[PDB]
């Protein structure tokens, strides 16, 4: 029942060719050539051979292409490893069948080594071989089964060596920082962006938490676009129940919905002070006041200032109010003074 | 010893997992229904991170009882049979087993209270160890018999001991902290696999266990050694259908996570 489809779907990609001889010679096209014609031998020889069934394993290389065709695969690392996981499988299960059949009928024109050999074995004895571990447990001991091993070896170890490397790079590591923050009942919490490296977030939580000020629960979350390092991952680890990173830009509406700006008591914006160009952080830093402020009006901002006369552009933004506590730590205007 | 009662412990580790994980749904289900969760979360979560006095006490006496735990497992691994019937006051490694459970049973709890959310907490890597390692021992002081089970799973446990030293600060340069990431990673990952392969080959196939490969543990992480290093010797090797078919997994991504791993290690 499943052949006659496998018939019909046949031409009906016949038709679609633009080019007929092209077609005939196409790699699938060869899986229907040594699949359908010995199964009408088989109605009428009266018997059934293993023979080449095994190439439908060969179909499995398709699938990305069913994939796509449906729109379900769209961003490339999605679509880069699911070709690399179906022809790594494919090639895997056919490998196996070839082996399976060699072994199995024995060497021609006498067949009198056939060496029982089961085809899940045989699975077994390919992904050893691609691994290059060779047990010796089982091995091939026919001729032909020896030649296709050589001819394997040649190709097949090229096909584990691309393939396993880049399926399980693709996957990657998980997104450790990520997701929305946990709302809590009467909580004050604070987001503080910026210049976030292990040189400012050390120096402000030991300030911010400290034996002499007023004791006072407030959280710090910190967000940030680069992965911190292992440096910053452990300085947080050790301020696991007051300090709180996320990953991603203040520039995002997402991620500011992601830390609750809304609901943050302040909003402090840390500067690179040891930066080449002023001009550029400093307008960098205004940007994200903006991105807040389109937020929501009503958020109290704090932001580490360089240079003075950049201090004109928030002052003029409609949002800036000073009376409900935002302010600008001008770092020339308190150096110089 | 007719017949085995290996499902007896397999089937309380299922069930403590499925009934611990519904009773969080069940929870939140009730909470739709419907203080000491303010102050016990933000405590434990200090326990359990160190930064109390009494937390240093706790985060130091678990790193040295998990390094106790696995030997308690080396040497119950050196015994040639997988089920043995025994009273608890017979042998005292039982009885200090039993000590050790308790401890990373209320340990669990900790964790649980300081757990922001539940459901995740449930499913974290973490937990399956002790789903399928104490509730097996209460199961064994209760039918009066000790099973090799899946007790190579505090293996694992050699995985946050970068965590406990960072808790400490004693890890401080970043190239400290990753160079004992990857060796933690590497020794849990070598004693675990071990482990899975002790257990398969000398149980033998299920449902019928005729198929018994003797094979001692230690002869096994001399196994997983030249089986990850792609040396194959084949004086040692895999009998059992079901040791062959975890090996074949292993060998898929033991050998590509070890690819980035020795390298960035000898550097
Ligand atoms: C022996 C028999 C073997 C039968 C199966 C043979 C292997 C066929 C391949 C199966 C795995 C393909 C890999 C799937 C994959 O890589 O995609 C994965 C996610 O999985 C998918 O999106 C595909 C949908 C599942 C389709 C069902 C596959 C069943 C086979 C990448 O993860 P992501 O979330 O980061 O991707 C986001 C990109 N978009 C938005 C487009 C989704
Ligand atoms: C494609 C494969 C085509 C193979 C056709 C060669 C058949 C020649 C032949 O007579 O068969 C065999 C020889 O079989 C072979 O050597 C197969 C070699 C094919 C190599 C494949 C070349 C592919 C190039 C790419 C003669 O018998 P024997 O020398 O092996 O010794 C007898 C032992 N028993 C009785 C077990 C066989
Ligand atoms: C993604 C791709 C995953 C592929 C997983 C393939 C796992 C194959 C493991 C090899 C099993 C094996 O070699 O033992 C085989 C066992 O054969 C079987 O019964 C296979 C049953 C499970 C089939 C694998 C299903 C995986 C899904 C030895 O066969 P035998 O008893 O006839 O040996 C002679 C005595
Ligand atoms: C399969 C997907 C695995 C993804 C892991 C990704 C990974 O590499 O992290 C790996 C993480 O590997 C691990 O943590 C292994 C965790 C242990 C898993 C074993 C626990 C379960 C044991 C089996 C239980 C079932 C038992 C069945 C028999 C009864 C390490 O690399 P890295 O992230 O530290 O280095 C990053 C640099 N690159 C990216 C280049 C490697
Ligand atoms: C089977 C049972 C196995 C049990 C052990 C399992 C493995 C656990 C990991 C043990 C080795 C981890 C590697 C340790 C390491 O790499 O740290 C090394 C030095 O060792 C240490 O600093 C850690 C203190 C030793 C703690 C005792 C570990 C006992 C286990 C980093 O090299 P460094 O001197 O250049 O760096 C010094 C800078 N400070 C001081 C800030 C760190
Ligand atoms: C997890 C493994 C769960 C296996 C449950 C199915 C058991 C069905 C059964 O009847 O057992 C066995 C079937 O055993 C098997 O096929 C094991 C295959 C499990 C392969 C693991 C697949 C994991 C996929 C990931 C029937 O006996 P037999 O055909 O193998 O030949 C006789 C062998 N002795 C003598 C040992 C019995
Ligand atoms: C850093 C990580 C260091 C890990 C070291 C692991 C060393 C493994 C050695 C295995 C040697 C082995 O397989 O022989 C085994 C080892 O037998 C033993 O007595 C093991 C005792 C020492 C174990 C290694 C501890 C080193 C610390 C022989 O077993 P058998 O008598 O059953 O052999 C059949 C007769
Ligand atoms: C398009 C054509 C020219 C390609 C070459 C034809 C190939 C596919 C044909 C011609 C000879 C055939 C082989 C003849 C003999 C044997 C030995 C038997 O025990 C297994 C099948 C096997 C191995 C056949 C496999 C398929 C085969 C190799
Ligand atoms: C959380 C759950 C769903 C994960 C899958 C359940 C796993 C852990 C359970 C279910 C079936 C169990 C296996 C059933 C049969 C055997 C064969 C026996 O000789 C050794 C134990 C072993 C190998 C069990 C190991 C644990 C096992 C694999
Ligand atoms: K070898
Ligand atoms: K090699």
């Not at chain 1, 629960?217 to 292992?230: A, I, N, S, T, Y």
């Not at chain 1, 830093?285 to 937020?295: A, C, E, G, T």
């Not at chain 2, 991170?49 to 080396?74: C, E, H, K, N």
Request: aromatic share 16%; net charge negative; hydrophobic share 50%.
């Amino acid at each position: 029942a499943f052949n006659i489809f496998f018939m019909v779907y046949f031409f009906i990609r016949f038709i679609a060719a633009s080019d007929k001889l092209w077609f005939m010679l196409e790699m699938y096209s060869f899986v229907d050539y040594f699949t359908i014609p010995p199964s009408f031998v088989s109605i009428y020889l009266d018997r059934t051979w293993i023979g080449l069934r095994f190439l439908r394993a060969l179909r499995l290389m398709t699938v990305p292409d069913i994939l796509q065709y449906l729109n379900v695969l769209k961003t490339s690392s999605s679509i880069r490893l699911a070709q690399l996981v179906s022809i790594f499988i494919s090639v895997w299960l056919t490998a196996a069948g070839i082996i399976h059949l060699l072994e199995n009928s024995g060497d021609p024109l006498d067949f009198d080594n056939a060496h029982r050999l089961s085809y899940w074995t045989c699975v077994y004895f390919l992904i050893v071989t691609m691994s290059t571990v060779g047990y010796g447990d089982v091995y091939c001991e026919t001729v032909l089964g020896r030649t296709f091993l050589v001819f394997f070896l040649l190709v097949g170890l090229a096909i584990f060596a691309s393939c396993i490397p880049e399926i399980i790079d693709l996957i990657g590591t998980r997104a450790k920082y990520g997701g929305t923050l946990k709302n809590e009942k009467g909580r004050r919490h604070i987001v503080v962006c910026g210049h976030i490296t292990y040189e400012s977030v050390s120096h402000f939580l030991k300030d911010f938490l400290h034996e002499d000020r007023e004791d006072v629960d407030v959280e710090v979350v910190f967000l940030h676009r680069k992965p911190p390092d292992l440096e910053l991952e452990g300085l947080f680890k050790r301020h696991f129940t007051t300090v709180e990173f996320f990953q991603g830009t203040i520039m995002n509406p997402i991620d500011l919905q992601r830390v609750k700006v809304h609901e943050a008591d302040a909003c402090l914006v840390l500067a690179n002070k040891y930066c080449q160009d002023p001009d550029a952080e400093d307008a960098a830093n205004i940007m994200r006041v903006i991105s807040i402020k389109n937020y929501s009006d009503d958020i109290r901002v704090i932001i580490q200032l360089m240079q003075y006369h950049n201090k004109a552009y928030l002052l003029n933004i409609p949002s800036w109010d000073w009376k409900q506590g935002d302010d600008v730590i001008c770092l020339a205007e308190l150096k110089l003074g | 010893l007719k017949v085995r009662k290996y499902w007896c412990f397999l089937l309380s580790s299922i069930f403590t997992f499925l009934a611990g994980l519904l009773v969080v749904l069940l929870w939140r289900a009730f909470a739709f229904v419907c203080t000491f969760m303010t102050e016990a979360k933000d405590w434990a979560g200090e326990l359990i991170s160190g930064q109390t006095t009494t937390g240093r006490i706790l985060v130091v006496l678990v790193f040295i009882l998990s390094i106790a735990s696995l030997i308690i497992y080396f040497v119950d691994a050196s015994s040639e049979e997988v089920e043995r019937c025994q009273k608890w006051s017979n042998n005292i490694t039982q009885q200090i087993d039993l000590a050790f459970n308790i401890f990373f049973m209320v340990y669990f709890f900790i964790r649980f209270i300081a757990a922001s959310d539940k459901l995740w907490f449930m499913l974290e890597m973490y937990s399956f160890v002790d789903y399928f390692t104490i509730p097996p021992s209460f199961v064994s002081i209760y039918l009066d018999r000790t099973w090799i089970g899946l007790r190579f799973l505090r293996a694992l446990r050699l995985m946050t001991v970068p965590d406990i030293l960072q808790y400490l600060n004693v890890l401080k340069t970043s190239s400290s902290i990753r160079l004992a990431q990857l060796v933690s990673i590497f020794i849990s990952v070598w004693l675990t696999a071990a482990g899975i392969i002790h257990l398969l080959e000398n149980s033998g196939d299920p449902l019928d266990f005729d198929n018994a490969h003797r094979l001692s543990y230690w002869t096994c992480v001399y196994f997983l050694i030249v089986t990850m290093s792609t040396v194959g010797y084949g004086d040692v090797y895999c009998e059992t259908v079901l040791g062959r078919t975890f090996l074949v997994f292993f060998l898929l991504v033991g050998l590509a996570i070890f690819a980035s791993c020795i390298p960035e290690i000898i550097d």
